[PDB]
Curated annotation (Swiss-Prot), chain A:
GO terms for molecular function: AMPA glutamate receptor activity; amyloid-beta binding; cytoskeletal protein binding; extracellular ligand-gated monoatomic ion channel activity; extracellularly glutamate-gated ion channel activity; glutamate receptor binding; glutamate-gated calcium ion channel activity; glutamate-gated receptor activity. The gene is Gria2. Keywords: Cell membrane, Disulfide bond, Glycoprotein, Ion channel, Ion transport, Ligand-gated ion channel, Lipoprotein, Membrane, Palmitate, Phosphoprotein, Postsynaptic cell membrane, Receptor, Signal, Synapse, Transmembrane, Transmembrane helix, Transport, Ubl conjugation. The postsynaptic actions of L-glutamate are mediated by a variety of receptors that are named according to their selective agonists. This receptor binds AMPA (quisqualate) > L-glutamate > kainate. Induction: Down-regulated in the pyramidal cell layer of CA1 in the hippocampus by global ischemia. It catalyses: Ca(2+)(in) = Ca(2+)(out); Na(+)(in) = Na(+)(out). Belongs to the glutamate-gated ion channel (TC 1.A.10.1) family. GRIA2 subfamily. The chain holds residues 25 to 496 of 883 of the full protein. It is a multi-pass membrane protein. Disulfide bonds join 54-306. It comes from the Eukaryota. GO terms for biological process: cellular response to amine stimulus; cellular response to brain-derived neurotrophic factor stimulus; cellular response to glycine; cerebral cortex development; chemical synaptic transmission; conditioned place preference; establishment of protein localization; ionotropic glutamate receptor signaling pathway. This is Glutamate receptor 2.
From Swiss-Prot, chain B:
Detected in forebrain. Detected in dendrites of neuronal cells. Expressed in the pyramidal cell layers of CA1 and CA3 and in the granule cell layer of the dentate gyrus. Induction: Down-regulated in the pyramidal cell layer of CA1 in the hippocampus by global ischemia. Homotetramer or heterotetramer of pore-forming glutamate receptor subunits. Tetramers may be formed by the dimerization of dimers. May interact with MPP4. Forms a ternary complex with GRIP1 and CSPG4. Interacts with ATAD1 in an ATP-dependent manner. ATAD1-catalyzed ATP hydrolysis disrupts binding to ATAD1 and to GRIP1 and leads to AMPAR complex disassembly. Interacts with GRIP2. Interacts with GRIP1. Interacts with NSF via its C-terminus. Interacts with CACNG2, PICK1 and GRIP2. Interacts with GRIA1 and SYNDIG1. Part of a complex containing GRIA2, NSF and NAPA and/or NAPB. The chain holds residues 303 to 351 of 883 of the full protein. It comes from Rattus norvegicus (Rat). This is Glutamate receptor 2. Ionotropic glutamate receptor that functions as a ligand-gated cation channel, gated by L-glutamate and glutamatergic agonists such as alpha-amino-3-hydroxy-5-methyl-4-isoxazolepropionic acid (AMPA), quisqualic acid, and kainic acid. L-glutamate acts as an excitatory neurotransmitter at many synapses in the central nervous system and plays an important role in fast excitatory synaptic transmission. The gene is Gria2.
From Swiss-Prot, chain C:
Glycans are attached at residues 32, 235, 347. The gene is Gria3. Keywords: Cell membrane, Disulfide bond, Glycoprotein, Ion channel, Ion transport, Ligand-gated ion channel, Lipoprotein, Membrane, Palmitate, Phosphoprotein, Postsynaptic cell membrane, Receptor, Signal, Synapse, Transmembrane, Transmembrane helix, Transport. The postsynaptic actions of Glu are mediated by a variety of receptors that are named according to their selective agonists. This receptor binds AMPA (quisqualate) > glutamate > kainate. It comes from Rattus norvegicus (Rat). This is Glutamate receptor 3. Ionotropic glutamate receptor that functions as a ligand-gated cation channel, gated by L-glutamate and glutamatergic agonists such as alpha-amino-3-hydroxy-5-methyl-4-isoxazolepropionic acid (AMPA), quisqualic acid, and kainic acid. L-glutamate acts as an excitatory neurotransmitter at many synapses in the central nervous system and plays an important role in fast excitatory synaptic transmission by inducing long-term potentiation. One of its GO terms (cellular component) is ionotropic glutamate receptor complex. It comes from the Eukaryota. Homotetramer or heterotetramer of pore-forming glutamate receptor subunits. Tetramers may be formed by the dimerization of dimers. Interacts with PICK1, GRIP1 and GRIP2. Found in a complex with GRIA1, GRIA2, GRIA4, CNIH2, CNIH3, CACNG2, CACNG3, CACNG4, CACNG5, CACNG7 and CACNG8. Interacts with CACNG5. Found in a complex with GRIA1, GRIA2, GRIA4, DLG4, CACNG8 and CNIH2. The keyword GTP-binding does not apply.
Amino acid sequence: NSIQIGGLFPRGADQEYSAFRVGMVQFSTSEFRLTPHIDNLEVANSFAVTNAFCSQFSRGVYAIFGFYDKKSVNTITSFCGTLHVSFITPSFPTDGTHPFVIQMRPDLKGALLSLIEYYQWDKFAYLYDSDRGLSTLQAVLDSAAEKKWQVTAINVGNINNDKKDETYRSLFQDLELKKERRVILDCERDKVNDIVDQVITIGKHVKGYHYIIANLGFTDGDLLKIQFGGANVSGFQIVDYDDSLVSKFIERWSTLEEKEYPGAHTATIKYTSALTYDAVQVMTEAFRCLRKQRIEISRRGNAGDCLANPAVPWGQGVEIERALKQVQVEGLSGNIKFDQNGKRINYTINIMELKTNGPRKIGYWSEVDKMVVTLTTVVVTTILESPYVMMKKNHEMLEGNERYEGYCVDLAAEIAKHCGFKYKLTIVGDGKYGARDADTKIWNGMVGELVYGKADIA
Amino acid sequence: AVQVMTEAFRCLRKQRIEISRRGNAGDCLANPAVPWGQGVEIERALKQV
Amino acid sequence: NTISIGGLFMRNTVQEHSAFRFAVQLYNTNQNTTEKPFHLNYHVDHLDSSNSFSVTNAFCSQFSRGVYAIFGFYDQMSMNTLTSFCGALHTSFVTPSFPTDADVQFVIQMRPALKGAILSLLSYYKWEKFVYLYDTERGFSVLQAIMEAAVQNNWQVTARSVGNIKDVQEFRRIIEEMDRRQEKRYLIDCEVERINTILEQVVILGKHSRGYHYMLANLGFTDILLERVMHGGANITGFQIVNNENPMVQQFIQRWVRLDECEFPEAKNAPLKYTSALTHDAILVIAEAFRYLRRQRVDVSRSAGDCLANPAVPWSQGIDIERALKMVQVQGMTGNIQFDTYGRRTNYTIDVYEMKVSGSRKAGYWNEYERFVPF
């Protein structure tokens, strides 16, 4: 049997549409398939979004897959909620709660806050785009007092606008006058290199910068250190190319003909396209067991039915909503599970850095734990405290273990001897003993060095 | 309550004189709800008395 | 002959609704036929706004009746719907609501921007370190302006989004944390209701009056409950666009408080909200625009039909009505009323109020040309 669904695609979401079509093939069976009706719309225009949504409602679909932006998200949430038609989307997840919305995209704010803490940043620029939204910036500003962050927030959404000269003046004051070198880029993934290029022409000693790309598709665009002027670059990734599921997908996707399947024939897939493919799996798993309503005729929709026809009875629509939210599957974006408000839970975001050989996973952030976890001669960590460890008076002439003397220097020699190991005395970087920050939940001092693997004995 | 309804309603729009017909309870399921924007005007008129 | 307009009212716009009926009433009962060449009609729809569906339906209903313009309200949720439909159908929306963050067409925004006045007064007081508490009910424009000015002027602003706080303990925790930073100066850019809640926690706490300065960025100054805080020695700065000494305001008010509570709810049990004065001024602007179109023998017909008709071709008179609306220069309850190409108040005046232990007074005024002028 078949179930009719809507598909509302923005102009320029070519690869996402290819991924949707590929998903429809992959997840169809001889026993069950989805029948989509595709509309292509200006998502920034709430009138046009209303017309599209209402036309799908009119046609009588089980669900609408689609996109929204900052300007149209309230249309979607209010119409879904009123008409009782489920909307499944890879768009930015909403801060609050809204029924009849299934959010394929994991929240990024938690992982970003954790990564800032992980690098122990206390001062940075935050380059945002107001047309994109300010929710993530607000999360960072909310935490800045408690975490002791000096944030300089700059709207690079105005970098080509009338506020352009103001934007350049702002970038100049922060990078040149204040010598900022830690930069968070919260922007459309395909705008990263354009913004960076501008930063590089404006700043100085740019090789020494450290960017965090606040976006879930770290490797969605080319990452060439040379393009970044030699800087450090960190970011986030929800599609793990080491996953067999993902590598198998890419083996197939990479040979699809690019004219026929715009955006395919690539070794990577944009995270939004991955979420679109995953959405087809979710709808398929949700719907394949729902009642086979009497085979009816599907007819072009009339947007006016939003006002002419009554809402789907809540008891009817909620069965579909619940079926979607109960789905538990593995997809390109990893473990997919939803809470009662349609938000992804139990997901993992990979933490990436751009290394010599290319982007590398250095760790991960799990939604259940909400901290950055690091992935893979005795190093003795110790502290300069008299009379345990002290700098000999003539340390300049001495190297290694010989630079120090004290109760603990002697004690180290004794236990190394009794245990049969060679060692290297190192003073703890932050000069602390070891306490766990109540907020960032991270260990400092000598304890931190043992917990994080930077030393093997204190 | 008759005073309240009288004060609330005497200023509301004089809708076109229609015919009043015995009601059918089944219309609770057959007919749509009064549009909220319409009904709320009457509700508010009552509460403002 | 007869000019009909639409009226889109929301939750908690009862007094503005009453001010709307009454201003239309004043226009029609004017004896002078030069001032009243046509009869002005309206149809009102009440809308929830919680829903984009509910909103589109109310707009489309009014639209199919064939209105020549719409007076109404939007909030953060309904704004995109209403302004996008008005823009697509070349139908002019005239509103007392917060001015849009974006530059749009077919929206005449009766309420002046507050940010220019806020920045000038921050400079007048030499605030270089302060707390900024804000909700986003009236747009992201002020927030974005403050953040950027903080960069450009190297200020130390501690900013907190408090629009989602339901537990008043949270306000006290925030203030204590600000105390530990020795914050004495507060810019509060919130809805009046939420400003009232904050000022109340300030009073409960104690010792947050003398030595403190609250700058309250909301044109609803007269509805803010600040007397207890005034009595404790705090400084307060406020903003208004309505002068109660203006003879026009005086004359409106004297008639207004004589209206009976049945035909005109909220006229006698509540002081006049500034948005009600803007509602009155909106009728002055609509009347003037159509008096102008008549004078100029420009016609306007519509018909009108289906708002989702595809296409999708707006009436040609649409542009002329918008143009007529945006070109007016009239004097109203909110002073001089003029608009730029984006329907934004231009050449408006904001009165600046100061409350100190030595008393309360208008401390000066702000306009776009001379900025802050104290007297």
